[PDB]
Amino acid sequence: TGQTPIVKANLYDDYGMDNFPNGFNAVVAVISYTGYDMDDAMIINKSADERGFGYGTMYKTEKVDLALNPITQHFGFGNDEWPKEWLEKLDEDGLPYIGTYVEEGDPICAYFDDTLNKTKIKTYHSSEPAYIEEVNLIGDEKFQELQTVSIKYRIRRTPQIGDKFSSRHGQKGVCSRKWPTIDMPFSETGIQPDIIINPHAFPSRMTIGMFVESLAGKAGALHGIAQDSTPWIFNEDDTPADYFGEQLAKAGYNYHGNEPMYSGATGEELRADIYVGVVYYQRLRHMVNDKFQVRSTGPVNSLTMQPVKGRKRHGGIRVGEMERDALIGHGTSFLLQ
Amino acid sequence: WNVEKFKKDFEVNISSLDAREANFDLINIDTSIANAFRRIMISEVPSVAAEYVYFFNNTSVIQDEVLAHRIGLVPLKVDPDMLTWVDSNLPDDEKFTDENTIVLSLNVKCTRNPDAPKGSTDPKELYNNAHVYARDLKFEPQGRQSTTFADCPVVPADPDILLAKLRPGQEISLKAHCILGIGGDHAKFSPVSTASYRLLPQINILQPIKGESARRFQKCFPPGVIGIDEGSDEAYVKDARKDTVSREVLRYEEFADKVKLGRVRNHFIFNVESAGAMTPEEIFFKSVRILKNKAEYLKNCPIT
Amino acid sequence: MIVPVRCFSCGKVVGDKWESYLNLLQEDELDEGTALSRLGLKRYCCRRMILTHVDLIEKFLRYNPLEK
């Protein structure tokens, strides 16, 4: 999903950024509530996420061709008695069916090796499944029997607790809780906040410009307008805080954008009609390892016995030279052992 | 305190009533309880939704999971009191019968229309069945259904819910399973287009504000909010149920001392929309009874 | 990708009033605000959705691998 930013930078239209969207006008919460949103962290409404909030998808593309050489590698099934259970994750031509689910280990391709008399298979090797999308197969310049093929894979990336999100104001925060829309504080107007960002992420950050976007966005929508926000249109005299703070008053809402709120749990009006609005937010790519990796026991090494690195092969975690000391310090000869 | 001293005093007024929503106030109750009602009408009142959705085939632009996710949101006009739940212990063949679930499919093939006004942009005349709406959703009755839902067929609350788009050669077809459930899980179940309350503001003026200060104070709030008196010239409150809590008055200094914005913690202004499934008054009934029940279930449970 | 089904903050259905919204800004030449009004979008959240749609789907539809 994608939208044209309510708060625009006029030059947006001229450069034609509508033909290639990138954000999504989001309802924003300037408040500390759940208390899981401190340390520059943030909060997402569950009911939004499922409703479709900034849902994305990933696409990987893999090429097959055992042209590591007089050809012998043909795609399909050979007469030899191969397993069988390959006839489900795969069609009779040796290429999989379109829109098939497949996780690590699953068959992708079937071919006969005339010098091996055994029909074998390239499998899928990503620590995460996918569905097929494309079906790419090309011949050489004429007959040159098939050799080269590929395909694309759809990989669901529902906004999970952990990926990064930040508006255009250097407001990087990670998600700590996906709060239930019922425990969320609702507005006098009757609005469960989409996003919650904590006010304690502001004083040592100084990104007031968001604060603007707020009333800026709220209004314009309420009235039906794109608010122009190109740099330096205001000066010390005519300030946004006023200009827009009016449009809000002339629309019917509180001046400085203050809105009355209630605590989803207790149910009584809070203390201050906390101030909130709308911001063009952006979903940051899975730029996270996230991938934990535990290690009961598995792969080691021939010359040392100690397990080697991995993550995808259950590699043990390194106890480097630094932690060696730490323990030494306390005086825990055993933990060391 | 006595439950009786409560029933005698407690009261409720109905402001506006409708098919899709209504307004009303509960007075003398405590805010804890009201709030409870809230979390309920949203997260615990059952309804119908599409869960499992099996793809017979899909060759449009809209990728699969997306497609699914969607319709699983579409509002469902079926009295959720006509279906039974689902036991999540039995395997898939015993878990889904007739009086258990609800079956719906949708089969659309799209092609080019060689009869287009040779010079048209619109995809309806250039292409055959390019757009797919919610009225396209087909109900396939199962046995105990051909009689059960014989009177009230199944139809999406909003028919023109634009579903899928496609150009010729493309098609979609895939029945989907559909049961009941509640919002506290997946909002698809939330039977309301939201619903919530608001404490009724109390505006109390300290000293009389007559003369010109009447038209200047009156115009510091929504309309009719502050009517001007006759002869006395002094303003007053008309209906505090019209205040937007703009706090406006508190801007112009002269008045920043003449009043005070406050609350009446026992007066609740309720408003409740609806997806379409259950009419409002109903969604309320269940909620109240929902709490009543949750309790009794406890009166009859022994301790460990 | 195309018109989101329900609203993002309440659930109120919305994926329908797309084709009418366009007809409102087109035939009736109403403004963005008043058009969102008579269309049943009161709270800003709902309005948001429509006011800023990107029917980018129609950009794809011009890449049909089933024709000349």
């Binding site: 006098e188 307008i225 005519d238 809402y253 | 402001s15 307004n23 309309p223 202004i269 | -």
Partner: peptide, 24 residues
């Protein structure tokens, strides 16, 4: 310097809960 010109026809697009628009 021209002031950032306010676009005109700003109407009330908000009222209390459970209320119409015709009140005005």
């Amino acid at each position: 310097r021209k002031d950032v010109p306010k676009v005109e026809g700003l109407k009330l697009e908000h009222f209390a809960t459970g209320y119409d628009a015709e009140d005005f």
